[PDB]
Amino acid sequence: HTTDTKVFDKVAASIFDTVAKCGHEASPSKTMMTPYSVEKTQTHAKQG
């Protein structure tokens, strides 16, 4: 529900901090956060 930049940045930071606090580590290099692309179980979809 936003198009602002810093809000999105702080949201992503909060998610990563929660994962770190859960005794795990999530790689930001390959973590996915996208509007128009879906990947699941070695299946890739782009724009339908």
Binding site: S29, P35, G48
Partner: protein, 48 residues
């Protein structure tokens, strides 16, 4: 998660999220990917 999908036409529409990609998260992901390519190429150049 519904599977009753049918397909109609191709369309073109303006991108609402075009301004969001100037954020820190995307810049960092791109930077990490490209630097990973750099270590790969320098290791290959060092070995042979």
């Amino acid at each position: 998660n519904s599977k009753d999908v049918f397909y109609d036409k191709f369309r073109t529409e303006p991108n609402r999220y075009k301004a969001l990609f100037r954020s820190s998260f995307y810049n960092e992901s791109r930077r990490m990917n490209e630097e990973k390519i750099l270590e790969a190429v320098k290791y290959s150049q060092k070995l042979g």
